[PDB]
Structures are given as C-alpha cells and as structure tokens.
Design a binder for this molecule. Structure first.
Ligand code: GDP
Ligand code: MG
Ligand code: MG
Lengths: 53, 194, 15, 427, 426, 436
C-alpha cells in the first residue's frame, strides 16, 4: 500500500516544500488574475469619467 | 561607379552633361539590367563603398564628470587613513567558524592545509611560531581536538596550563593600552590610550 | 530653487 | 542611449513644441527646467537640478521662434538652441537652398557639433520637417547633405510631411516636394510619411473633433514618436533599439519609406464603449482607415512590419494576434519575405497631456510597415508636378534664385526611376 | 572535482542562466547572499563543480555573463541571486549587435572576444579537472548567435578534447519575433554542426505548447520557459553532483547518443510537469514518469517523433526507485513500438539512476532523444532561407560587414547535406 | 457561441428595438449598460454572451447594427432611452431615403453605405469566437430593406460563404398593404432571396393583426404589438442557445432537419399560446393543447391555409415547464389527426426542442406570463400559392409598364424584370413538383 501512504506532489497553493527546484509550482500561472481586471476596469472608469467631465 | 544617377547631385551631372554627354548617357543606361534586385544590390554596394570612404566620428569629445558638491576643494580631497581596526589578522572572520563545520571536513581541511586551520583554532595568535606551537600549549585547543577526533598526548608540554606569554588568551593577557584589564572612562585610568 | 553652491556662496559659519 | 532631434520649418518646430511638452510631462519635468535616469535620452543634466532638451529649433521666420522664446517654456530651452533666421524662403526651394541656406547652415552645424560632443552614446539623429514649405525643404536638404557628409554611419530618421493628394496650402509645393524627395532618397536612413489629410480624417472619425487644428495633429505625432522611443526610454519585456529599424524594415537601402499607423486612437467617450485589448487594437492598426498617409496597402504588398507595444501587453497575446494577421488573406505579404513581422513590448503605456483628446488607455500599438503604395503616392504627386512643368509655370522664380531648368528634369527622371523600382520590386 | 564552466550569451542566454543558477542554488541550499543554509551533507561534497570558495563561505557560480546591451545586466543584478555573480565575470561590450549575425561575429566580436577568452581561460584553468563547457544562447539574435558562435569556435580551438553542451533555442515560423531569423539560424547551425560536440535543440513554440496544455497556465511568460530550460540543464548533469546506482557523466551520454560525428542534435523533455488541477489525480511511480517521458506533448522540440525514427535515446532518472522497473519499462517501450526505432542499433535506450531527487520532489526524470525527425525543422528553416537569399533580401546588412555570399552558400550546402543524411538514416 | 443580427430598413430596426428591449429585460441588463446583480438563475453564467459582448466592464453592447437610409428613426433610437447601450458606431444611418425604389437603394444609394456596413460587421465577427450564423430582419416592400438588403446579402455570401443567414422578412399581405409599387420590390427581392438566404421565415402583417384582434383582443393594434410578438418568437427561437434545456438545438440544426433541398427554404411561423391576461386564468396550460393550437391556421403568422398543402418537415421549440414525456405524447397525438397530412417524403417529419426557462413578460406588453409556450416552424407548399398570388398582381402592373420609368432612370433595365418573373414561375413549378 505504498500508493495509499504517499501524498500528492503539491497540495494547496501554499506549500513549504515547493521550492523553485521542484517544478510543481510555477510563477507564470497567476492567482487572482481576474482581480487585476476589476481594478483596471475601475481605474479606466474613473479616468474616462474625469476626461468626459 | 553608381548605376543610378540618384547619388550624384544636380549641378554635378548638369556640368557633366555640358562637358561630356558620353558618361552622361551611361549613367542613365546603367539601369539596363533586367533584374531590379541585382541593380539594388549594386546600388547597395556603391553606397556602402561611399560610406567606407567617409571616416568615423567619435561621440565622446566632451568628457563629463559628476561632482559630489561641484567644488574643487571637495573633489580634490582624499580621506585620511584613520582606523580603529584591530591589528590582529586572526580576529577578523575570513572564513566560516570551524566549530559548526563538520568534524571530518575539518580533519581533511587540516590535512590539506595546516596553517589557516591553526590560525582559526588560535584567533589571537599572530606569528607563525605561535600558531604552529603545539596542540597542548593552548587550553582552548582541547575542545577543538576532541570535537574533531584529534588525540592529545598527555603532559604536552606541561601539566600546568600556561606558557603562552606573548599571546593574550585565557586568563593570561593584558592590553598594551594604559587602562589594563579594559574599561577606561577617564584620563586618570587612561581612557584606552597608550 | 537654485543650486546649493550659488544660494549660499559666501555664507560662512564661524565659531 | 541618447538621441537628439532637430526641427526644420514651421511645421517641424510646432511638432517639436508638442513633442517636448509631452516629453517633459512623461518624465515629470517641470517647465521651469527641474524636477519637483530614464530622462537621459532627451534631457542632459546640466549643473545641479537642471534638465535641458537635446534639440535645436531652427527656422527662417523669427515670428514663431521668438514667440516660443517668450512663451510657456522660456527657461526649459537653452537660448542658443533656438536658431532663428532673418528672411523666409517664401515657399522657394532654390531660395532656401542657395540664397539663405549658406549663412544659416554653419551656425546650426557648429551648434549640433557641441550638442553631439556633450553626448556620449548618441544613437542617431531624427529630423522633423515639411517638404511643402521652403525653409523645411530648401535648407533642410542642405542640412541633411552636410550631416551625411559629416557623420554618415549614424542613423537619420526622417518624419516628413508630403502634400496631400488634394489638400494643400500653396501652389508651388510640387516643385519643392520633388526637389526635396530627390535628396531625401540617399541621405536619410528611415523615412516615415505623414500626410495631414489622413490625420484630419482620423480626428474626424475616431476622435470626433469636427473643427481640429494643427495642435491635435502635432499631439498625435508626438504620441507616435513617444511610443516609438519608449523602448529606449523604459525597460520592457522585449525592447528594440533605434538600429533595429534599418535591420528589419529596409530590405534594400534605396527602399526606405514607412507607412505610419497608431492604435487605439479613441475618444474619452468611445473608450468607455469599445473594450481595449491587444487583439482588437492590433486588428485596428492594419485597416486602411487608420493610416497616417493617404495610401491603400490593399493595392500593394507588404515587405516588412514593425509593431511597438506599450502598457499591459504580454508576449502570448501579441504573438497570437500576429499569427492571426499572418493567416489573414485581406492583406498579402511579398513572396520573398516569408516572415515580415517584428514586435517590441514595453511596460509603460502612453501618458495623456491636459487639454488633449486621447483617452487614458492601458495599452497602445504603433505600427510601422513597408509597402508599395508609396509608389502610388509618388505617382500621384508626379502627375500634378508634370502638369505645371509642361507650361514652365513659376520656373522664373527658381532660375533667378540660382538654379536652372536642368534640376527640374533630372529630379523628375529620378522620381520616375524610383517609381520603376517600387513597381518591379514587388513582383 | 569534475568541473562545468557556464557561459551565457545574449539576453535570452542571460535570463536562462539566471533562472538556472537560481534553481541550482536552491538545490544546494545556497541563499541569495551566497552562504550555505542547507541541511544534508550530500550538498557540500559536489558544489565545487559549480561554486568556488571566495571568503567566509562565499560560493560564486562558475559562470560568464557576456552580451552587448546593459538592460540584461541591470535585470540580472536587480533580481534575486544577482549578488552571487562575480562582477569581474560580467565581461561586456557597449554598442550592441541588433539582430545581426555579421555584426556579432566579425565587427563586434573581434574586439570583445579577447576579454571573454581571457575570462573563460582564467575560470577554466583555476580548477583542476575540467569535465566540459556549457553554453546557453539563441539562434535568432545577433549578440547570442554570432558572438556565442565565435566563442565556441575559439574555445574549440584552444581546448579540443573537452566536452561541451550547447543549449540553443531555434526560432520557428509559427512563433517568429524578428525578420532575419533564418539568416542567423542557418549560419549558426552550419557552425554548430562543425564545432559543437552535441546540441540541445530548444524552441519557444514547444515550450509555449507545453505551458498551455500540460501546465494549463494563464500567463506563460518567458519565466516559465526559462524555468523549464533550467530544470533540464539541472537534470542532464544530476549524476555529477549526486551519487547513484548507475552513474553517467556527460561523456558517457555523448558516446551512447552519437553513432556518427555529425548526428549530435538531440530533442529533450522533462518529467513530471502537470497542471495545478491535475496534480491531485496522479501518482508518483516509474510508469507514470515514463509515459510522460515518451509522450510527444512533453517534447520541448517542435518535431513529432512519430514522423521519424529513434536512433538512440537516454533517460536520466532521479530519486529512490528499483533498477528492474526502469529496465523493464525501457524494454517494453522498445519492444512495443518496434517501427519507430532503428533496426541496426539494438537496445537504443541508455538508462541511469540517481538516488537524490530535486529538492521538494519525490522522483523526476529527464529524456535525451536522438531521432531523425530533428531534420524537419532544418528543412522549414532552409525553405525560408532560400526564399530570402534567392532574391538577395536584407543581404546588404551582411555584405557590409565584410561577409560574402559564399558563407551563405556553404551554410546551405552543409545544412542540406545534414538533412539529407538524416533522411538517409531514416 | 454567439449570433449577430443585422436589421435592414425602417421596419427592421423597429423589430430590433422590440427584440433588444426584450433581451435586455430577459438577461437583466440595465439599459445604461451594466448588470446590477452578478448572480444568475437558470441558464447559468456566461449566458448573455451570445447577444451582448463584454466590453470593458460594466457595459454589454449588443452584437447588432441598425442600418438604414432615412435618418429619422435611427436618430429617434439614438435620442431615446437606450443611448448608452447601443454603440454610436453601430447605428448606421444614411442621409437620404431609397423611396420605395429597389433600383435606387440597390444601385445609387446603397453603394456608398454597404462598404461601411461590411467593414463594421467584419470586426463584429472578429470580436466573436463561436459565431453560429447571421440572421436578418427586413421588409421587402420598402426601398432600403428590399434594395440594399439584396446587395448586402450578396456581399455577405461572397465574403463568408456557407455561413447561415436566417431571413425574417415581411411580405405584403394579399389584401391589406401600405404601398403601391411594392410588387416590383418584392419580386426583385425574391430573385436574390432564393439563392442567398439560408432559411427564410415568412411574416405577413395582416395575419398578426388577426391574431391580435382575435386572441389578445386589442381592437386597435399598432406596429409595436406586432414587433413584440416577433421578438417573442425570436427569443423562443434562440432560448436553446442562450439557456440550458433537455434537448437543446443550435442554428445549424434547422438547415439540417427543415431544408430538404437548398432552394426550398420557406417557413411558416406559428406561436402558442397567444392569449390575453384574463383568458390566461380560465384556460389551462399543458403541452397537448398548446401543441394543437400551434398547427391551426388561425394562429399562424402568415395568411395562408396549410390544409391546401402538404407538410414536409416541422420544428417545435418548447419553453418553460416541459418534459420529454408529455411533448412526445402530444406529438404522437398530432400524427393521428388526418385533417393535416405529411408528404410521403418524410414519415418522421418532426423535430422537438425543449428548454427550461419560461418566456419573460415585458411591462406594457399584452401577452400574459405563462408556464410554457411553443414556437413552431414548418415547411409546406402554401408558399407556392402565396408566391403565385403575389405574382398575379405583379404581372397586372407590368403589362402597361407602369412606374417602370422610375427604376430605369436609377440605372437598372427591364431585363431583370423578366428574369425575376421567370424565376418566380420556376419556383412555382418546383413547389408544385415537390408537392407531388
Ligand atoms: N526561452 C527564451 N527565449 C527568449 C528569451 N528572451 C528572448 N527569447 C527569444 O529570442 C528571440 C530574440 O532573441 P534576441 O532578443 O535578439 O537575443 P539577443 O541576441 O541577446 O539580442 C525571440 O524570438 C525570443 O523568442 C528568454 O528569456 N527565454
Ligand atoms: Mg515653412
Ligand atoms: Mg424602407
């Protein structure tokens, strides 16, 4: 039962054993990427409202 | 020899035609080449040769130097050599401390190099005779010896722990400064001066 | 605003 | 990484006035001359807490020059930089090239000498001028000649203004245009065309200003050049230097005529209507209605393309958009060029000036390509140039100024040969 | 005690080297300030291959960073692990090449390579026994292709018996940045086929495909590509720095992968690489590693192995495993796909086992395949090169540096006969 | 999955005004542009994407262009409530009308605006990713709808090819009509609607008038009610794409299961239940009776009698509280009725489509909020008698060459009149032979 007793390569986004040498974590995939879009949208809304005024 | 008359100026070819219509009638007919790309390559070659005829120009004629406060006095100053640094070289840490480094590593590090090992074991020693004196002369050597598995013969050199008068280690030492045993705060005791 | 060396060129502290 | 810009003529120095306002605003340099390392490409740090532009405004009419001297940026510009002549060329290439040019070119040359000497890593020169006028076309030709014989190896970017196919302010502009484009052939390294009618239509349709002036056109030109030099100014994901254009845009030294485009040119109200993504701005940068010169690339074949990206751009989306455009069959590339694209990415998006009309956008695209519609532009100008020269109209003005009839004919012949090259290269 | 000297050329080479050194320093437990902070003793014994003792446990990489534009140096110094590189090793020009092979090989290399040659000679003779050199560069740029090529030629002139790895990316028409990519790529390949010992063929197209499909990332920037290339460069040389049940150095892999001297263009992949969502549904076993090994998706080469034949192949295993399992997996993969392997070379696969997995991982693996499907990218580069050169396009930027068209003709002849022999052996 | 709709003519953009109001009320889009609540019920998230594109954020612009030659109605749209919703660039308006002249709007005025329509719809499609097909609204009696519509459809066909183009046209009623020269426009529109439209849905105006006077009991119905019924039909048509159902059907399902031959695409529209609010409470709502009411000629959207023809294929769209078992029972019941017959060409001439979200109701409208509804699209041979009925009164005019000087002056000639007459006659012969 070695397959029962082992743990997956990486569990959760935060893991102390996942350093750069182990490629189970990548900087390219960006969590909260959608959250940047909303901030960009609100900033653009403010900009365009001011310019139109 | 440019195939196209584009390279020449206006009045240059005008005077050429006034003088010789002969060359004036080649520099137009030089474009008789069927392939335009070949003629473009020849034009590139003649332009490149003309550029090679011209000389390069350096862009650093006027040297610009940044000045800290734009004053000659400040710029021309060199800081005086004033240091309160310790005279002993062994006091400085030029390497990782030998204590944490592994025992077998320290052993073969000694085996290739005795000298800097002896200096690290004896930080206060400054002359070669002091560092390479004996493993039994300094009382602090025994913890290093039995940590790194170096056997120490008994009674070396003497049983009584002593015999390093020059180097200030253990309880046998006194600063050359006037307030010996340290802590000089007034002129009466010396204030750590001579 | 002007450069420091021209704002106080002759101003000298003296103790 | 320093570049100096010289401006010839009324239009050239007005474009420079807009360009330097934009440059001072983007780097946070107050108009008095001091901030309240990226600026080193335009402003040299003189003394302490002072920045002076690396430019000279040279013109023959003292009106605009001293009006600038007494205007907003009195202390920003070094007094000796603003060269001013005494008499106009009066829309006469011969006058400004032989009569007035000989006593104004020397001062500009030995001023630009010390301007270049002040620099250390000069990338090259870039010229702003209009061929319609006399000062820009007349003595600009002599200045280009003397710079080419003086330096030679260094780049000289040319942002010139041809007369529109129908819009024009004078009558004798075909003669000036031909006599200037002959010397523009073998002296400038990269030539970027800019016609006023195209910018007028861009403002009318996209920016929707129904009564625009030269100020908006100059602001758009300044935005384009700023987005073009932002790669040198700021560090980005993939930067390209000024020596990349001649490397990947001109297959032959006699073919340097670039079509200018910009995206997104949008107003503050429509920007809130269209979504702003890399794909759609890249698509909009290739439509014939968003070009800065009146020519249709559909009638021509693309030889090379340059893409400048600013703001929120990553290589994945720009690569995808480039692939999609490459697979598009509305525009066709020339056969001997199987890959005529070059993309550059910068992180800083373009800034906006107060009083402007462009919206604050997260990303922008500056497109520069090489096609064969420039051969259509040259022929369109050539027909109306030959219309006048048949009856020898206005010739007496040029002959009395120093030249003769031979120059007109030989410039016409060179234009015809240049035409020939444009059609038979694209085969 | 077997020494590897790292050389980085160009912007892409510098970024790849920075990522590789960051990963290597993480493997050996070296902090960004340059001091040891690890736990096991297995790390101290074999750091002399990449690190040198300066003072107070200061470990400096045996790397040379060389290019022409200061932005790359500023980026390397600004980021983490930018304070471990010795400033003297930052040999560096001032003008720039700018996507011109001729400029980087005749006019700018001529005055810069002398300092680079002195630095690399000092770095190589400082250590006792060189194992080989290792260079990472590009075939599209100017300061990476031509300048790195001239450096390779020179160090081949000086040290002919030492081994040498060349991690080079090849531009592709599907993902093409510049315009003159074939012009530089053909000459670089023509030089590498005669100077390099063996070549690791890389392509940004395959890297993007891997990051999009197997990794399922949202914004696969250049960091991911450099991470994958750095992981591979670490994986190739794992046996040198760690013990194992069957060791294999660079020379063993080279002799087991090169049947003929001109066949040294290998295609590479790494295992395991799975998305954040698919990590929960997988196991860590040797079959799990090998099925991802032999998959064409995991290939960082833009060539399908099924369209050709496998001459030789190699597997670099890491972690605690059983030799019998690896041997039988290789036997099965050879026995089942009997048509994709060449007939006159029995036992096409080289196998090796290392006991130390990369830090934080249970097991890992690396694959080095020498297939005859590598020639198809050379064909799709030669077609563009002959489309350009037949009309003498953009040639004036190469002729003006002194270069002649005979160089281009010889480069095309060499690459054409190379692809002809690759087709012949298929 | 997305679909973009183009509206041609004065009536086309009125129908579009009704349809887009219904869409905004159904998808919960505030007419200023944004959705107050991000939560979704029924179809789920990303449901709105087939009609509204996510521009910036806080706005959802429709994937439509209103193109017209007379600027009055387009400016009325621009000035009304939905200023912020529609893009200023999508409401294409000309400067002068086509004046009920196929020639004028097909050769003189349409040439300067068709290029702009095409280069806007090109980027509309470019923004899309899963374009199912186009669908059009126009009236063939007018000048812009009939004249410019032909050129626009021809250029769309040559620019795209086999892409679906659903045609929701409005034919002149045999007795009740508004114009005089409209037979010419209608025939010259048919000569190209034959070979360019993929699926054509007929919509007569007097049939809907009879439906309103009979069922919804508005004794004074105007065009707004007709447009609202058309909008309800189109919504019940695209609900399968927009929202989740038991048996969802997309656009390329209709051409496969309703078009036996490429030149035979003419659909009678039907809808049930068209009932008022007071009649809705005393009348039960089940699949059986609303399916039966979907085949009666009294509830058809075109003034024709299917009893005189033979059904070739039928399509049934269901909405609301509908399950497969009872619709299967209802469709089994229909096949027993010998009053309506199916051509022996296709024994299983039925295709059912089931959706779960009930049709929405609009404040100010006249339809009642119901549990379920049926949208019926069939193919039969009454189209043959409709075309011949129009043909007779078109041929009445041409014998005396009336109003022909208007068309010839614009730039056309009289030969295409004859070829359109021959094309209509050939269509009659084709329909008659198919009916055998
Ligand atoms: N994998 C990878 N490829 C890169 C990187 N940087 C640039 N490239 C590729 O290299 C090509 C251009 O190289 P270039 O910038 O001219 O290198 P240079 O010689 O140093 O100037 C582009 O097509 C890129 O796809 C990197 O960090 N990683
Ligand atoms: Mg002027
Ligand atoms: Mg109408």
């Amino acid at each position: 039962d070695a397959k029962q007793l082992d743990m997956p390569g990486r569990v959760g986004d935060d893991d102390n054993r996942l350093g750069p040498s182990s490629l189970q974590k990548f900087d390219g995939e960006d969590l909260t990427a959608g959250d940047r879009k909303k901030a960009q949208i609100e900033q653009s809304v403010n900009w365009w409202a001011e310019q139109t005024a | 020899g440019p195939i196209y008359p584009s390279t020449l100026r206006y009045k240059d070819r005008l005077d050429c035609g006034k003088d010789d219509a002969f060359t004036y009638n080649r520099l137009y007919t030089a474009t008789q080449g069927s392939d335009v790309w070949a003629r473009l390559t020849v034009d590139a070659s003649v332009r490149q040769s003309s550029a090679r005829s011209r000389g390069s120009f350096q862009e650093g004629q006027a040297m610009v130097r940044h000045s800290f406060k734009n004053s000659g006095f400040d710029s021309n100053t060199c800081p005086a050599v004033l240091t309160h640094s310790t005279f002993k070289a062994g006091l400085y840490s030029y390497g990782v401390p030998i204590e944490e480094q592994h025992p077998i590593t320290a052993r073969r590090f000694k085996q290739k190099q005795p000298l800097e090992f002896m200096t690290q074991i004896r930080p206060h020693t400054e002359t070669t005779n002091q560092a390479l004196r004996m493993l039994g002369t300094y009382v602090s050597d025994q913890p290093h010896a039995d940590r790194l598995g170096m056997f120490i013969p008994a009674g070396c050199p003497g049983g009584k722990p002593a015999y390093h008068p020059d180097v200030t280690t253990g309880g046998f030492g006194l600063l050359p400064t006037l307030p010996r045993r340290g802590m000089g705060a007034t002129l009466t005791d010396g204030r750590n001066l001579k | 605003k002007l450069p420091q060396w021209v704002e106080n060129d002759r101003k000298v502290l003296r103790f | 990484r320093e570049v100096i810009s010289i401006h010839i003529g009324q239009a050239g120095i007005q474009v420079g006035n807009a360009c330097w306002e934009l440059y001072c605003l983007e780097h946070g340099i107050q108009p008095d001359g001091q901030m309240p390392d990226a600026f080193n490409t335009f402003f040299s740090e003189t003394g302490a807490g002072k920045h002076v532009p690396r430019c000279i405004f040279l013109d023959l009419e003292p009106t605009v020059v001293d009006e600038v001297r007494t205007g907003t940026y009195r202390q920003l510009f070094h007094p000796e930089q603003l060269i001013s002549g005494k008499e106009d060329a009066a829309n006469n290439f011969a006058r400004g090239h032989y009569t007035i040019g000989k006593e104004i070119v020397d001062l500009a040359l030995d001023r630009i000498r010390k301007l270049a000497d002040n620099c250390t890593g000069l990338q090259g020169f870039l010229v702003f001028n209009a061929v319609g006028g006399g000062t820009g076309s007349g003595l600009g030709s002599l200045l280009l000649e003397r710079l080419s014989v003086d330096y030679g190896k260094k780049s000289k970017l040319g942002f010139t203004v041809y007369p529109s196919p129908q819009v024009s302010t004078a009558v004798v502009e075909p003669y000036n245009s031909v006599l200037s484009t002959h010397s523009l052939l073998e002296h400038t390294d990269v030539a970027v065309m800019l016609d006023n009618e195209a910018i007028y239509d861009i403002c009318r349709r996209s920016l929707d200003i129904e009564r625009p002036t030269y100020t908006n056109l100059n602001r758009l030109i300044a935005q384009v050049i700023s987005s073009l030099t932002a790669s040198l100014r700021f560090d980005g994901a993939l930067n390209v230097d000024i020596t990349e254009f001649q490397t990947n845009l001109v297959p032959y030294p006699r073919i340097h005529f670039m079509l200018s485009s910009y995206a997104p040119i949008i107003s503050a109200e429509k920007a809130y209507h269209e979504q702003l993504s890399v794909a759609e701005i890249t698509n909009a940068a290739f439509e014939p209605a968003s070009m800065m010169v009146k020519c249709d690339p559909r009638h021509g074949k693309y030889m090379a393309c340059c893409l400048m990206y600013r703001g929120d751009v990553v290589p994945k989306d720009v690569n995808a958009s480039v692939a999609t455009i490459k697979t598009k069959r509305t525009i066709q590339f020339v056969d001997w060029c199987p890959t005529g694209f070059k993309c550059g990415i910068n992180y800083q998006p373009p800034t906006v000036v107060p009083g402007g009309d462009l919206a604050k956008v997260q990303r922008a695209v500056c497109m520069i390509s090489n096609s064969t519609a420039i051969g259509e532009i040259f022929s369109r100008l050539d027909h109306k140039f030959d219309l006048m020269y048949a009856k020898r109209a206005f010739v007496h003005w040029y002959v009395g100024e120093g030249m003769e009839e031979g120059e007109f004919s030989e410039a016409r012949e060179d234009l015809a040969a240049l035409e020939k090259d444009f059609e038979e290269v694209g085969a | 005690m077997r020494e590897i000297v790292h050389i980085q050329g160009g912007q892409c080479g510098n970024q790849i080297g920075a990522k590789f050194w960051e990963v290597v320093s993480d493997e050996h437990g070296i902090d960004p300030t340059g001091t040891y902070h690890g736990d096991s003793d297995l790390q101290l014994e074999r750091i002399n291959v990449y690190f040198n003792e300066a003072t107070g446990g200061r470990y400096v990489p045996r790397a040379i960073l060389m290019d022409l534009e200061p932005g790359t140096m500023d980026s390397v110094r600004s980021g983490p692990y930018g304070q471990i590189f010795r400033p003297d090793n930052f040999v560096f020009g001032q003008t720039g090449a700018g996507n011109n092979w001729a400029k980087g090989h005749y006019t700018e290399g001529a005055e810069l390579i002398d300092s680079v040659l002195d630095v690399v000679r000092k770095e190589a003779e400082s250590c006792d026994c060189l194992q080989g050199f290792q260079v990472c560069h590009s075939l599209g740029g100017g300061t990476g292709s031509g300048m790195g090529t001239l450096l390779i030629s020179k160090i081949r002139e000086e040290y002919p018996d030492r081994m040498m790895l060349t991690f080079s990316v090849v531009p592709s028409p599907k993902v093409s940045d510049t315009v003159v990519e074939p012009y530089n790529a053909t000459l670089s390949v023509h030089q590498l086929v005669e100077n390099a010992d063996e070549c690791m063929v890389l392509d940004n197209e395959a890297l993007y495909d891997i990051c999009f499909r197997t990794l399922k990332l949202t914004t696969p920037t250049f960091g991911d590509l450099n991470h994958l290339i750095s992981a591979v460069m670490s994986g190739i040389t794992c046996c040198l720095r760690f013990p194992g049940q069957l060791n294999a150095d660079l020379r063993k892999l080279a002799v087991n992968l090169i049947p003929f001297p001109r066949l040294h263009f290998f295609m590479v992949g790494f295992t395991p690489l799975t998305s954040r969502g698919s990590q929960q549904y997988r196991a860590l076993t040797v079959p799990e590693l090998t099925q991802q090994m032999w998959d064409a998706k995991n290939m960082m080469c833009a060539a399908d192995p099924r369209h050709g034949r496998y001459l030789t192949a190699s597997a670099l295993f890491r972690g605690r495993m059983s030799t019998k399992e690896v041997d039988e997996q290789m036997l099965n993969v050879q026995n089942k796909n009997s048509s994709y392997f060449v007939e006159w070379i029995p036992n096409n696969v080289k196998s090796s086992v290392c006991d130390i997995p990369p830090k934080g991982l249970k097991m890992s693996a690396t694959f080095i395949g020498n297939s005859t499907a590598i020639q198809e990218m050379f064909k799709r580069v030669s077609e563009q090169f002959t489309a350009m050169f037949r009309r003498k396009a953009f040639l004036h930027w190469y002729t003006g540096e002194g270069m002649d068209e005979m160089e281009f003709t010889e480069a095309e002849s060499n690459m054409n006969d190379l692809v002809s022999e690759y087709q012949q052996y298929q």
